[PDB]
Design a protein around this ligand. Sequence first.
Ligand SMILES: *[C@@H]1O[C@H](CO)[C@@H](O[C@@H]2O[C@H](CO)[C@@H](O[C@@H]3O[C@H](CO)[C@@H](O[C@@H]4O[C@H](CO)[C@@H](O[C@H]5O[C@H](CO)[C@@H](O[C@@H]6O[C@H](CO)[C@@H](O)[C@H](O)[C@@H]6O)[C@H](O)[C@@H]5O)[C@H](O)[C@@H]4O)[C@H](O)[C@@H]3O)[C@H](O)[C@H]2NC(C)=O)[C@H](O)[C@H]1NC(C)=O
Ligand SMILES: *[C@@H]1O[C@H](CO)[C@@H](O[C@@H]2O[C@H](CO)[C@@H](O[C@H]3O[C@H](CO[C@H]4O[C@H](CO)[C@@H](O)[C@H](O)[C@@H]4O)[C@@H](O[C@@H]4O[C@H](CO)[C@@H](O)[C@H](O)[C@@H]4O)[C@H](O)[C@@H]3O)[C@H](O)[C@H]2NC(C)=O)[C@H](O)[C@H]1NC(C)=O
Ligand SMILES: *[C@@H]1O[C@H](CO)[C@@H](O[C@@H]2O[C@H](CO)[C@@H](O)[C@H](O)[C@H]2NC(C)=O)[C@H](O)[C@H]1NC(C)=O
Ligand code: GLC
Ligand code: FE
Ligand code: ZN
Ligand code: ZN
Length: 341
Amino acid sequence: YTRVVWCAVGPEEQKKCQQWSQQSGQNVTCATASTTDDCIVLVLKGEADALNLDGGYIYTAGKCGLVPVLAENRKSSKHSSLDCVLRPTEGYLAVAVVKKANEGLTWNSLKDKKSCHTAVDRTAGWNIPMGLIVNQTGSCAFDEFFSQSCAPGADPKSRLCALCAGDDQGLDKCVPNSKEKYYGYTGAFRCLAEDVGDVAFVKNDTVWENTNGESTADWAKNLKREDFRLLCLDGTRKPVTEAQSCHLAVAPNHAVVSRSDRAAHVEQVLLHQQALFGKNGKNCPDKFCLFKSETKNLLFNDNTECLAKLGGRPTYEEYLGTEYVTAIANLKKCSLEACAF
Ligand SMILES: *[C@@H]1O[C@H](CO)[C@@H](O[C@@H]2O[C@H](CO)[C@@H](O[C@@H]3O[C@H](CO)[C@@H](O[C@@H]4O[C@H](CO)[C@@H](O[C@H]5O[C@H](CO)[C@@H](O[C@@H]6O[C@H](CO)[C@@H](O)[C@H](O)[C@@H]6O)[C@H](O)[C@@H]5O)[C@H](O)[C@@H]4O)[C@H](O)[C@@H]3O)[C@H](O)[C@H]2NC(C)=O)[C@H](O)[C@H]1NC(C)=O
Ligand SMILES: *[C@@H]1O[C@H](CO)[C@@H](O[C@@H]2O[C@H](CO)[C@@H](O[C@H]3O[C@H](CO[C@H]4O[C@H](CO)[C@@H](O)[C@H](O)[C@@H]4O)[C@@H](O[C@@H]4O[C@H](CO)[C@@H](O)[C@H](O)[C@@H]4O)[C@H](O)[C@@H]3O)[C@H](O)[C@H]2NC(C)=O)[C@H](O)[C@H]1NC(C)=O
Ligand SMILES: *[C@@H]1O[C@H](CO)[C@@H](O[C@@H]2O[C@H](CO)[C@@H](O)[C@H](O)[C@H]2NC(C)=O)[C@H](O)[C@H]1NC(C)=O
Ligand SMILES: OC[C@H]1O[C@H](O)[C@H](O)[C@@H](O)[C@@H]1O
Ligand SMILES: [Fe+3]
Ligand SMILES: [Zn+2]
Ligand SMILES: [Zn+2]
């Protein structure tokens, strides 16, 4: 009945889950997979219960029957009275970021540049930006637009993996899990910060979180915001402060998914679990925090205040919204009702 097998992607996430599992008295247990796609398979098979997922993977998962349960919620300034759990989710701002010194570089001079993506099939990293780029260009040749990239999940032998580093040993080049140096929001941003790339497709929170002494991490301590710039679709360039008026799209929050025959029970264990290890949780600061991993967004983005109830008991199409659901479907014409397993 009341035991949840969570699916960790990669070895860094397995160690946070094991610790979570240590402190939960087996209320949560951990399966492990190499890539998000594999984890979705494990949950389909019933060998794992649930996992937190970027909107891009939620669309894959959805075609395969999986259902969103709870969603991540960050610090908000509208909806002050409402408790985090009952508070509506705001989404997040996909942005294209560049280095200020890289003068001249505009959304209209991206062709043949170098790019940093979070991973293939994710929202801010891949689907919005590449979606705009296929539309604007009239061609599915997205593999020929940037000269070199790090798009974790693309063919290791391809130009789309050229700029990825792999792990400390140089192994696992381009793998779509935290072992890649330039995987996910932080890695894609680092990718630009180290001047490995000309542009990084991350979200707004990422720039702020890793700049102005916020990360303390070796590669990020000396980073200042004012050395960065966003690329608007109006061909302009703005400071990281004008995010609301210079973004590519608003992205539906990452959410936990499960099989629907389990959602009721996944939902219950987790609400309890967060009362214990969440932002103001009984045993967070002292013993263990579910929502902290030191700029590494492991299992959950470090900016999650809490996971929140959904309300409108929404399906996956409704959760992602008809706007975004069309964006992906158009883009998948390039690579029409499926379940890719
Ligand atoms: C892109 O992503 C960035 C990073 O994620 C994000 O920046 C982050 O924003 C959040 C909030 O959205 C910041 O957190 C906040 O920081 C402050 C200061 O350290 C914290 O302290 C205060 O918290 C108060 C309690 O919530 C807050 O009250 C708020 O509510 C009151 C009343 O409801 C209201 O206050 C107003 O004050 C007026 C002046 O006297 C007064 O006349 C008026 O009547 C009014 O009541 C405001 O609504 C207020 O927001 C205080 O205002 C303080 O904020 C606070 O708890 C919270 O922790 C993050 O620090 C920040 N990240 C970084 C790295 O700085 C960007 O904003 C994102 N960009 C976009 C476009 O979304
Ligand atoms: C890449 O490029 C493709 C090709 O253009 C693009 O796909 C297209 O996206 C469009 C926008 O997302 C789609 O148009 C949509 O809007 C209409 C209108 O409905 C909306 O407007 C009304 C009034 O303003 C609102 O009240 C309503 O809430 C909607 O927001 C949609 O169809 C409408 O449906 C309503 C139902 O209430 C009817 O009453 C209307 O008469 C009308 O039929 C439509 O379903 C779209 O959501 C367009 O459909 C879509 N084209 C194709 C072939 O799929 C991608 O979005 C681009 N991608 C990226 C990344 O930009
Ligand atoms: C594992 O989960 C169970 C279910 O919530 C917890 O046992 C309940 O905990 C609450 C709070 O202590 C009690 O009020 C209930 O009486 C307990 N029993 C039930 C309802 O079965 C337990 O606390 C969790 N264990 C850990 C270590 O997190
Ligand atoms: O406008 C963006 C919105 O898109 C979707 O409906 C999401 O479910 C919601 O979190 C987000 O606020
Ligand atoms: Fe995302
Ligand atoms: Zn907008
Ligand atoms: Zn509905």
